[PDB]
Structures are given as C-alpha cells and as structure tokens.
Amino acid sequence: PVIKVRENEPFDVALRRFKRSCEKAGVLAEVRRREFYEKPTTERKRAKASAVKRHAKKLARENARRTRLY
Amino acid sequence: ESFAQLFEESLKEIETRPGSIVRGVVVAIDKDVVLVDAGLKSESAIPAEQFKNAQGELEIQVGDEVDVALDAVEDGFGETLLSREKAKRHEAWITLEKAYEDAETVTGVINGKVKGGFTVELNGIRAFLPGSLVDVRPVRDTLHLEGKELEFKVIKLDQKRNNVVVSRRAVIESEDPWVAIAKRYPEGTKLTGRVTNLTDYGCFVEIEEGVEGLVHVSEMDWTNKNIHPSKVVNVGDVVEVMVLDIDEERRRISLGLKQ
Amino acid sequence: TVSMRDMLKAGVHFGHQTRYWNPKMKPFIFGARNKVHIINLEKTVPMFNEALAELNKIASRKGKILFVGTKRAASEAVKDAALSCDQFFVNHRWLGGMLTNWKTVRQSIKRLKDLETQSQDGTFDKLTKKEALMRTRELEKLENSLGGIKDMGGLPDALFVIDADHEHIAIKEANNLGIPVFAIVDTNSDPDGVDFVIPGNDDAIRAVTLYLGAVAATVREGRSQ
Amino acid sequence: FCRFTAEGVQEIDYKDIATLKNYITESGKIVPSRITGTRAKYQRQLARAIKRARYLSLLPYTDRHQ
Amino acid sequence: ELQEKLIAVNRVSKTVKGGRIFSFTALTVVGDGNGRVGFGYGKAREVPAAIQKAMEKARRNMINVALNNGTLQHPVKGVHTGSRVFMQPASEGTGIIAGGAMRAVLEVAGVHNVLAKAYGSTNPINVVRATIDGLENMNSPEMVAAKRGKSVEEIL
Amino acid sequence: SMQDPIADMLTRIRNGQAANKAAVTMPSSKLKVAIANVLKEEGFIEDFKVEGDTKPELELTLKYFQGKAVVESIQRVSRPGLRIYKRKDELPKVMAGLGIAVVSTSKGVMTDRAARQAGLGGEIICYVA
Amino acid sequence: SLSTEATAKIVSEFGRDANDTGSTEVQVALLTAQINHLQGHFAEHKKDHHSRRGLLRMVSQRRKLLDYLKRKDVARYTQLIERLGLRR
RNA sequence: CGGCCCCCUGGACGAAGACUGACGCUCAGGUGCGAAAGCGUGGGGAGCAAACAGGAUUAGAUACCCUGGUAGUCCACGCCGUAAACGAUGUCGACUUGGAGGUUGUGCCCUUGAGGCGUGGCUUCCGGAGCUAACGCGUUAAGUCGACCGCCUGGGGAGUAC
C-alpha cells in the first residue's frame, strides 16, 4: 500500500486514500488470520461452513422473497 | 395438424428477441403501471416513466404500439425488459445514419461538460460527449445564449461504452475494458450511467462498456447512514456519476454521487 | 366451440419458463421457444371442449358451479364471469377449509348476511361512530371474502379453477369431498388432483378472460336446457 | 467475461508482461477470478505465468520488497 | 346396520408450564359386515368425547373390500410403519384367527374366516392401518380378469 | 457385472409399470423372448417386439387398466445364486391362482397351470400377479 | 509410459496382421515390456508406491491374459512364454 | 497431495476408427498401501511445543491465561498398523420423473459477440415417485432388482481377561 501525496492534495484526503488502499490489500485481515495457528481441519470447516451459509443466503432467501410479507 | 407445427415456425418467423418489432398493444393503463402484450407468455409490468415524453405527461392511450425488449425470461412471473431501451437502438440507427452522408443533422444543444465534453441531448434523452466534440474550434458555448440551438456534428464516440461528443454551432463547418483504463480516470471525470441493481449497500451504476461501479451508500446524498439507496435515487436511471477512484487490477471502480 | 385461432390470439399457447415446469405436464407441452414452454393446442382444445360439455351437463341438472381465481389480475374478470351466468365465485383469497369446513363457514356467511340486512333493509342508523365504523369494516371484510358464495346454500356440484398450483388448497378440498374440478393448468402446475385438466396460460389476462367466457356461455346454455 | 476465451489463446505467456500486469494487484498479488471474470482453466495458467515472471524478476513478488 | 368397535383408548400427555395436561386417544373401527370398513382415530380431554370423535371419523372415509363369501380372495400382505401383517383366506368354520386390533377390523369388515399373523410392531393404530391396506389392495377374480383382458374361466 | 438377465428384464418391467412408461426396451435373449410371449398370452402386457440382427432389442409394450398398472407384482424365484426346481405336484399357485408362475419345463417355458396340465414340473422362473 | 514407436514394434512382431494390436499375445507382450521398463525405475525409486500400484495392476492383467490363453490354446501360450521368457 | 523449474513415473477422460472375442464380477485365507502420535539408528533444529519451570487466576488450579521451554514436529532408512481412517452408507452391473450450478473434454452452427443447439466424464445443492422409526435419501438412492463378500443378535462386565 505505497502512496505518495499529490501536489496541492489535502492531508485528510490522502489519509482516506491510504485507508482505502489498505482495505483493498486486506492487510489487517491477513494479520488477524496469522495471529494464531488454525488447524487444517478448522480452516477446512470454516471454509465449507461459510460456503454453506452463503448458499443458504442466496437460494432459500430468494425463495422466501417470492412471497409477500404482508 | 402440421398446421400447428407450420404455425409455430410461422410465429417464430414473425417475432424476434430484442425490442425491435413494435407489437405490444397497450391494453390497460393505470398510474403508475402500463402494460402491453407483444405476443409473449405474459404481459409486461411497464413503468409509466419509460412512457412520458420530455415534459412529464403520458403520450400513448389504449391500442398504441411500442416494442420493449427481451432475452431475459421469467423472474418468477412476468415478461420483459423495458421498451425505453428499444428507443436507444433507434437513436443508434440515427447516429449510424451519419456514416452514409458523413453528417447526421438534428439539433444539439450543449451547455456544459460534466467530464470534459459538453452534454448533448437528442429528443427525450441527453448524452455526454468528450470535451472537444461540443465546439468545432475553440469557440466555447459559455458565451453563447444558454442552452442554444444548433444540431450536433459528431466529434468523438467511444463505440463500445456509449459516450458521444457532438459539434454545436458553426453550420458552415463540414481484457477489453481493463488494459487501457485511463480514459475516464484522472481524478473526477463525470459520467452519465444507468443504475442496475441496488444491493442495500450500493446502487451499481455501470455503463462504460463492460465495467462495474458502486456509489455504495456513504455519498449518494448529503446524509450518511439512514439513507437506504432505493428511497433516494431510482431503479434503472441515468445519473450524475464520476469515478473518484479506479483500481484497474481488482476491477473496482468506486464512483460517487455526492458531487 | 372455442376455436384454435382465437386461443392463439389470446396467448393460450404460451406457458412458463422451462426451469419452472412440472414434468407431469410433459404430455401437454409441444416445444420450447426462446427458453419458454409452449403448450400443445392440438391436445388442449379437445380437452377444453370436453370440459365445457361436462360443465354444460352439470348445469342442466341444476348444478352449482364455483369459480375460483385469486391471482388479483383476473379477480375482476372471474367475478364478472360468475355473475353473467348467476353462479358463485371466490375472487379473493380462498379461506382454508371453505368447503371441507363448510358448517363453520356457513355461520360466517349467515353473519355477513345479517350485517348486510342491518346496513340496508333496517334503515335505523343512529349508531355509535366507532362501533358503526367497526361494523362497516367487518361487512367489507365479509363481502370481500364470501361475497360470491353467500347464496350458495350448501356445497357446489363442480369447481372451476383458473390456476391449479395457486389454488391447490381449493383443489385438495374438492378432492377430499369428491367435487368435480375443472382447472386451467399451466406448465408449472400439477394436474394430478384435477379431474378435467385444461392445459393453458393461467397468467395472461386475455387468455383467462377467454377461458372464463366460454365456460360462462356453456353454463348459461345448460341452464336454458 | 473472459479475455482469453475471446482472444482464443492456446497458452498464456509469462514473457507477455503487459498482459500479466492487468491481472496483478498494485501490491503485486494475483487478482481473483471473481473480479477479473477469467475462466477457471485460463486463470490457473495465468497464475503460473505470473509466478514464472516473478522468478525471472519480470514481475515483482510485492510492492514493498527491494 | 353398521357395527363399530373401539379397539383401544390411550392416555397421552402434553407438558406445560404448570405441569402435565392429559388427554385421551380413541381408536375405533366401523363396518357394515360386508366389504365396507373404516377406522377412526379421535382425541379429546375426556374419553367418551374422544371415542365419539373417533367414531365420527370412521364413519366418513370408509373403504370397500372384495370378499369371496365369508373369507378373503387370496393371501395378502399389508404393511404400515412398524406393523407388517399377513392374512390368509381360510375354510368356513375356522373363524378369525388373528390378534388384537387386527381381529377387530376383520370382524367389522365381515370376514368370518381368516388366518392372520401380525409380524413386526403390534401398535394398534399402525396394525389396523396395515390390515386396512392389505384388505384394500386385495383384488377379486373378476377385477383381475378385467385388468388382464380375459374371462373368469380363463383365470379359474 | 450383469449376472441375471431375466431378473433384470423383470426389474425393468416393474419400473416401467411404476413410472407409467408405455413401452420398455432391453437387449433380447431367447429365454427372455419366451417369457415375454408367455406374459402376453396371460395378458399382463399388450405386445412384444424384437428388432435387430446383430444385437436385437426386445421391446415390450406395457398395459394399464383404469390408470394403474396391470403387473401388480413380478418377482424372480429361481436366481443364479440359488436355483428353484419344482416337481409337478410341488408347483405353486400365485395369488391363489389369480396370478401366474412362469416355469421352464422340458416342453418349453410355460405358466404353472399349463405345466400342471401337461404333467411336468421344472425351474420356476418368476411369479407375476 | 511405453514410447509409441516401441509399442508399434511390439505389435508388429507378435501380432499376426500387424494392424491387429488387440491380440492377446500382443497385449501380453506390451504389458511385459512395460513391466521390464518399470523395473529399472522402481530399483531407483523404492518409495514410489502410487506408481508401483499401476505396475502391479499391469502384472495382474498380464497374468489374467496368460491364464485366458492357457485354457483357450495351449501351444500358443507356450510359444508366447518361450518368446517373452515368462517362468509361468 | 498446494511456490517455481527439470528428470523418472502411475492413473483418468474425450475423439473417432481398427483389433481381441466373455478374456468378466466378487473374494474367506494371503499380499500390499495405510493420518497423527509413537519407536529404532544416523543427521538436522528457525518457528511451534507434550513434559518441565516460574508468574497469575482460584477455596484449591498438578488446568484454562502469561513468560520461558525439552522430546517431537523436519530429512534419510527401518518398524508401528491404528483414528469420528466418516458419506458413521462394501464392491460390480442394470433400470426408474425434474431443476439450478461447478469443472473438464468434444461434434455441429453465420463464433455475424462474451454466444446457439447438442453429446460424453467427474462433481455441489434442491426436490418428485418410491423408500424410511422418523430425521431424511432421492439417477452420485437410503428407490426398483441381481452377483459376491464383510458384519450384527439386550445393556453393562468388555473390545477386557486367558
């Protein structure tokens, strides 16, 4: 996330840009992930579980949507 | 018999997929929903806003015929994509007509450049063009009487992404998105883009030849968090948006609307 | 009676998208144009005619017909159809156990009737404003629900339906009691509960109207006979 | 909306650095097939090419390193 | 004309904030001494009411059974849930050789002569159902002839 | 691997009956053909039709009376794992005579009743009801 | 795997027609050659278990083929086993 | 089983043809492969960390938390032969409504464009008939059948003793 302040650019704006860049990188997230050792099994489980959740969100909810709430 | 088989291939022969054949007769009007029947499986829920012309009031009663569009079938119940895009093809045909005699003539009136090219509006629709196209020379329509009457002489068109810059006054004078993503880049180039779907965090305005823009929720207005983008703008509408940010790598052009 | 050309014009031949189909409707389907299922009009028409005939026959023995269509697009039309041949109908949401649980619903009907009488024949007026309002609301509710079936008395001797998948509860009820069913059945719907299936476009308004009209005519004819 | 299907390329080239550069991050990372919309078959190839390039110092492993 | 036999009555509970709410289930079966049979399963806070309900249920949703004289037409198996049931036609005089719930259903049906074992579960409700199923499926000679496109003498 | 062709055929027939299939096709065999013929005679199927020279396909045409299927039950009895041979006195009665038992005898494949009449038993192929 | 040319050569020698390729004897020969080739590999790479599985399978197949040959036609089998030098 | 490269090497799938001509399926004993930990001999040892030590916490804390930390984890060659070694679902074959995908071929079609119409392999989810104690399974069956094998017979005692 290397950044250079442009000529006649505000500080705040620059900071914001930097933040955005960082977010894009996913650096903080990566750091968080590597704080502690995740057993392979655990890693697998999370990934599959997450996937399942995503699938549920996509399809079941869509089905629900077809019918009106009131 | 084979009467029906022949009738089927006949009816295949006498329809096409896009909004081309002006076939749907308006068979019920109620504000705010028009509805047609172009020989499809169901009737369209048409907005009223694909059919009022240039000052706000309706133009077509019962029996009237506009084609719509297609290639999308069944979201649960219903049939179409809107006929207003239909209209775009007609506009494209008129723009194309230029090529034949190297001069399309209508009226173009361009007061100012959102992103470096005066805006030209033809009939109901208004389009944005690159900065040169508005004036033949360095004349500049800022000194001209505001929203003046000329025509449009075309300066530049982008051929994939739809941006057309046209020539006001001077009658006498006569893979693919992502490599060179530096055209609308530089900090704040304003664009005219139709929104597609508003995902409760976003609005997804994306027009410039196979890209994706967001205008997510933070700008959109001059209130931050209580906004809910479906209330505040539209569905399917061409708006004020500019880039504010491009990543040509993780294709996220992050446009804005508070400008 | 009803011609093929007319049906075509209406938009009977159109069906639902291919992903929403029922494979029990594979006999009644002809093909798939632009990823949308086309109902076979050669197989539909005779069936339709048969159904009409049956309806007429029913009418002739003084049969009570019930017209069901709670789509909300063709709610106006079904009511009209019903009224033309002075028969009964359910154009708004079918009350779960209308027929199976008639004896309870008979009380509701009675109540509605009473309310109507109070409104009209009494001419008393002089009622507390909130109470009066409440009464009015109740009346409205009843009318919406059971307006068509208030003069039905008992159970109907046949049941005409505009969509089988949408009115499955009604259909099921009719099967439990054994009332003949005359359902319009699009490609997505299930024809197994239906006695006299009619393969046709439930969704399109003009088609629905057409379906109604012929039926009404046949009922009238039966009555005349 | 894959580029390589349309171009109809037999194999992605690590030497074709410019092309690669569209699919790499500002931070050097290879961009996901969700974002680019690259076809799966091609994506792997692209990745491989990028890796090769990195070995040959044609592309950088990361923005920071020096 | 209809005969009606309450097979079983069972007390069933529902736990609530206070304690246990008790109720009674009545399994009955009714028949006209000919083909027609129907079981009913009724439930109420008091027994008699429950029984009545069951009877009412039974009286509607009856079912016809083809009976060659006093007995069945051929050996027939019937299953439902745990209860799997075998019943076999038998010579005049032998009586209903069958156990429990199964017997009752047979009696009302107007079978007089059967050899019938209930394998598996003998949960009255299930077993009666099984019996009913068995009876229902059982086809006659005439019916079979009709099915096959033959006369009765061709089948024997 | 395919170990019992007759059994397979029977299974196919059953499935057809279940699924309301008009006709059921399979690779032809002489025994199979005979069985089909027998069935036809006894009136459980409409017609059978063998077709082909190199690898011929037997096609049975299933029967449906009043909606439901005709072949109510159809089980193999003899099977490669465990063969069943009956003497003319020990020959069974399927559904107390209402169904049939296909039995292969020295004088060709026939229904159980036929076999009895002849005065000979044999390998019991299948019960059909 | 066995190189194309080698395979062709093998086919030509053992196969009667040379276009045949599927002759039992020919197949056996092909198998045998492959086995021979793989011996060298496996001397080097003793822990390559996965690869060895394939070899084992091939061997089994060859054995089966031999057995088949034996019941059908003994003389031919004998000839084959002389040619290849298969102890059985 | 996961950076990249090379060498040796096993299987799978498709496309057409050509050939062989039942050579097949299953398999008690038998043979092999078999995570992690563990063992032996010789190397290696950054990080992590059973054991151990101290600091906390606590009524206690032979734990959880913290600071350290050795076997081990890594390599070579042997042994061990077990795991919720799981889809808690033996292998092989046949047959029985559908939908939405993913992946990897391949035939035709104006690829007029990212497409259009098929046809094969493997695969994720939903669901019909049927099945099931129900939960659920559902063309990758737990459906309808056949072939072979393995295994179960109340809980504990015990997968223990001899």
Q: Got the DSSP string for F55-113?
A: S-EEEEEE-BSSSSBS---EEE-SBTTB--EE-TTT---GGGGTSEEEEEETTEEEEHH
| Angstrom resolution of this structure | 14.0
Helix (H, G, I), strand (E, B) or coil at D66: coil
What is the distance between the alpha carbons of residues C15 and C36, in angstroms, rounded to a whole number?
7
β-bridge partners, C159 = C66, C181
F12 CA, H29 C1': Å apart: 39
Give me the sign of the Cα torsion angle A49, A50, A53, A54: negative
Which residues are within 8 A (CB) of C39 and not within 5 positions of it... i.e. 6 or more apart? C12, C13, C14, C15, C28, C29, C30, C186, C187, C199, C200, C201
Torsion, Cα of E50, E54, E57, E63 (10° steps) = 170
Q: Is the CB of F88 under 7 A from strand H?
A: no
Alpha-carbon span B36 to D2, nearest angstrom: 37
Distance from C-alpha of F67 to C-alpha of D52, rounded to nearest angstrom: 68
E-chain CB neighbours of F128 within 8 Å are none
Tokens of C181: 């069913």
E68 and E142 both lie in a single domain: yes
Sheet holding E3-15: strands in order across? E3-15, E20-31, E37-44
Reported residue count of chain G is: 88
Q: Which residues of B touch A5 (CB under 8 A)?
A: none
Helix (H) or strand (E) holding A47: helix A40-66
Phi-psi region of B56 (alpha: psi -120 to 50; beta: other; left: phi over 0): left
Does residue B44 contact residue B78 with C-beta atoms inside 8 Å? yes
- For residue G3, give the nucleotide whose C1' atom is nearest its CA: H9
User: E116 forms bridges with which residues in the sheet?
Assistant: E87
Chain G window 44-73: residues with CB closer than 7 Å to nucleic chain H are 44-51, 53-58, 64-65, 68, 72
Nucleotides of H under 7 A from a protein CB: 3-5, 8-11, 18-25, 32-34, 48, 77-78, 92-100, 102-105, 113-115, 117, 124-125, 128-130, 132-134, 143-148
Spatial distance between the Cα atoms of E42 and E44, rounded to a whole number of angstroms: 7
From chain A, pick out residues whose CB is under 8 angstroms from the CB of B245.
Answer: 20
- DSSP secondary structure, C32-79, as one string: EETTEEEE-HHHHHHHHHHHHHHHHHHHHTTPPEEEE--SSSSHHHHH
- The partner residues of B129 in beta bridges, in order of sequence, read none
Q: Cα-Cα-Cα-Cα dihedral of F25, F30, F32, F34, to 10°?
A: 110
What b/e sequence results for C90-116 when a residue is b if at least 16 CB atoms lie within 10 Å of its CB, and e otherwise? bbbebbeebbbebeebeeebeebeebe
CB atoms within 10 A of CB B119: 21
Q: How far is the CA of G42 from the C1' of H24 (A)?
A: 31
E76 and E42 fall within a common domain: no
| Determination approach | cryo-EM
Residues in Cβ contact with F40 at an 8 Å cutoff, skipping those fewer than 6 apart: F46, F47, F48
d(CA E127, CA C152): 42
Residues 39-78 of F with CB under 7 A from strand H: 75-76
Q: Are residues E118 and E138 in the same domain?
A: yes
Interface contact A66-B76, CB threshold 8 A: yes
Residues of chain B neighbouring C29 (CB-CB closer than 8 A): none
Instruction: Give me the residues paired with residue E114 across strands.
Output: E89, E96
Helix or strand (DSSP H, E) at C30: strand C29-33
| Chains with at least 3 CB pairs less than 8 angstroms from chain B | A, C, D
> Where exactly are the structural domains of chain A?
1-56
Query: Looking at residue B74, what DSSP letter applies?
Result: -
| Distance (Å, whole) CA D17 – CA D59 | 7
> Reduced to 3 states, what is the DSSP secondary structure of residue D64?
coil
Token representation of residue B159: 């051929």
Give the strand pairing for F85-86 and F57-62: unpaired
Q: Chain D closest CA to A69's CA: distance in Å?
A: 33
- Specify the DSSP element, H or E, that contains F48: strand F45-51
The integer distance in angstroms from the CA atom of C109 to the C1' atom of H46 is: 87
Task: State CA B124 to chain mean position distance.
Answer: 11
G61 conformational bin, left if phi > 0, alpha if psi -120 to 50, beta if neither: alpha
Who contacts F61 (Cβ-Cβ below 8 Å, separation ≥6)?
Answer: F22, F23, F45, F46, F47, F48, F49
Exposed, middle or buried: residue C175 (CB in 10 Å: 0-12, 13-18, 19+)? middle
CA C71 to chain centre: 10
| Cβ C204 vs Cβ C187: under 8 Å | no
DSSP E58-86: HHSS-B----BTTB-SS-EEEEETTEEEE
Is residue B116 a contact partner of residue B185, using CB atoms and an 8 Å limit?
no
User: Nearest to residue B235, comparing CAs of B28, B49, B45?
Assistant: B49
Eight-class DSSP state of D32: P
CATH topology classification for F74-128: Dna Ligase; domain 1 (3.30.1490)
The Cα-based distances of D51 to B178, D48, D62, D66, E103 in angstroms read: 21, 5, 12, 18, 81
Q: Which of E99, E5, E139 is nearest to F94 (CA)?
A: E139
Residue B167 to residue E10: CA distance in whole angstroms: 93
Instruction: State how far the alpha carbon of B119 is from the alpha carbons of B110, B112, B128, C42, D4, in Å.
Output: 5, 6, 4, 57, 36
Q: Is the dihedral of CA C170, C176, C177, C183 positive or negative?
A: positive
Specify the residue for token string 């509607």.
E60
Q: Is B67 exposed, middle or buried (0-12, 13-18, 19+ CB in 10 A)?
A: buried
Provide CATH code, domain F5-69. 3.30.1370.30
> Which of E150, E137, E138 is closest to F40 using CA atoms?
E150
The verdict on residue E123 lying in a domain is yes
d(Cα B184, Cα E26) in Å, to the nearest integer? Answer: 80
Question: What CATH number is attached to the domain comprising E97?
Answer: 3.30.230.10
Q: Which residues from chain C sit within 8 angstroms of residue B17, using beta carbons?
A: 34
Q: In sequence order, what DSSP letters do the residues of B79-143 get, joined into one string? A: ----HHHHHHHHHHHHHHHHHHHT---S------BTTSSBEEEETTEEEE--GGGG-SSS--TTS
Read off the tokens for B124: 């109901």
Cα(E135)–Cα(E89) distance, integer angstroms: 11
CB atoms within 10 A of CB E133: 18
Give the integer Cα–Cα distance in Å for B170 and B167: 8
The answer to whether C112 and C137 are in contact (CB under 8 A) is no
Interface of B with C in 61-100 (CB under 8 A): 70, 73-74, 77
Q: How far is Cα C72 from Cα B77, in angstroms, rounded to an integer?
A: 13
d(CA D41, CA D38): 8
In chain C, residues 19 through 78 whose Cβ sits under 7 angstroms from any atom of nucleic acid strand H: 19, 21, 23-24, 26, 35
Q: Where are the beta strands (DSSP E) in chain A?
A: none
Q: Which residues of A touch B76 (CB under 8 A)?
A: 66
Nearest to C41 by CA among B38, B2, B74: B2
D40 touches chain A (CB under 8 A): no
* Spatial CA neighbour of E69 closest among E29, E117, E115, E110: E110
Tell me the three state secondary structure of residue F120. coil
Q: Does F96 touch chain E (CB under 8 A)?
A: yes
Tracing tokens 């009696």 back to the chain, one arrives at E107
Query: In this structure, are residues B207 and B167 in contact, taking their beta carbons and an 8 Å threshold?
Result: no
What domain range includes position E32? 3-63
Burial class of C215 by CB neighbour count within 10 A (0 to 12, 13 to 18, 19+): buried
- The residue among F93, F95, F113, F117 with the most chain E CBs within 10 A of its CB, best to mutate, is F95
In a domain, E12, yes or no: yes
D51 touches strand H (CB under 7 A): yes
Which domain-ending residue is among E14, E42, E63?
A: E63
Helix, strand, coil in percent for chain E, rounding step 5: 30, 35, 35
Q: Quick check: D2 CB within 7 A of strand H?
A: yes
Q: What is the largest CA-CA distance in chain A?
A: 56
Residue B133 sits at φ, ψ, to 5 deg, of -60, -35
D29 touches strand H (CB under 7 A): no
Q: Is the CB of F20 under 7 A from strand H?
A: no
Measured from the Cβ of residue C192, the count of other Cβ atoms closer than 10 Å reads 12
Give Cα separations from B211 to B86, B160, B178, D30 (angstroms). Answer: 22, 11, 8, 19
CB–CB of B252 and A24 under 8 A? yes
Asked if the Cβ–Cβ distance from A25 to D64 is below 8 Å, we say: no
Which sign does the torsion angle of CA B66, B72, B73, B79 carry? negative
Query: D6 — contact with chain B (CB < 8 Å)?
Result: yes
Q: Are residues E10 and E40 in the same domain?
A: yes
For Cα atoms B182, B188, B189, give the angle at the middle one, nearest 5 degrees.
60
Q: Is G19 within 7 A of strand H by CB distance?
A: yes
Determine the distance from the C-alpha atom of residue C203 to the mean position of all C-alpha atoms in its chain, rounded to a whole number. Answer: 14
For residue D64, the chain A residue with the least C-alpha distance is: A2
Residues E13 and E44 in one domain: yes
Q: Which of the listed residues E38, E63, E88 is the one where a domain comes to its end?
A: E63
Token couple for E55: 């009877």
Does residue E29 sit in the same domain as residue E101? no
How many domains are contained in chain G?
1
Q: What is the C-alpha to C-alpha distance for residues E136 and E134, in angstroms, rounded to an integer?
A: 5
Least Cα separation, residue B195 to chain D (angstroms): 19
Establish if D8 touches chain B: CB-CB under 8 angstroms: no
Nearest to C65 by CA among C224, C225, C221, C215: C215
C1' of H136 to CA of E16 (Å): 29
Q: Are C102 and C66 in contact (CB under 8 A)?
A: no
Q: Determine the distance from the C-alpha atom of residue B239 to the mean position of all C-alpha atoms in its chain, rounded to a whole number.
A: 10
Q: Is the peptide bond before C203 cis (omega within 30 degrees of 0)?
A: no
What is the separation of C-alpha C140 from the centre of its chain, rounded to a whole number of angstroms? Answer: 21
- CB within 8 Å of chain A, chain D residues 14-33: 25-27, 29
Q: Looking at the structure, tell me whether residues E35 and E91 fall in a common domain.
A: no
Least Cα separation, residue B138 to chain A (angstroms): 29
Task: Using alpha carbons, list the distances in angstroms from residue E111 to E27, E38, E58, E99, E107.
Answer: 20, 14, 18, 14, 6
Q: In which region does residue C201 sit, left (phi positive, over 0), alpha (psi from -120 to 50) or beta (all else)?
A: beta
CA atoms of B6 and C216, how far apart (whole Å) = 32
Cα C69 versus chain centre, distance:
4
Which tokens in the block code for residue G15? 């196969």
Neighbours of chain F (3+ CB pairs under 8 A): E
Determine the Cα–Cα distance for residues G53 and G59; give it in Å rounded to an integer.
10
- Phi/psi of residue B37, each to 5°? -170, 90
| B252/A24 Cα distance (integer angstroms) | 9
Cβ of D62 near strand H (distance < 7 A): no
Q: Do E136 and E72 belong to one domain?
A: yes
Tokens found for residue C116:
């109507």
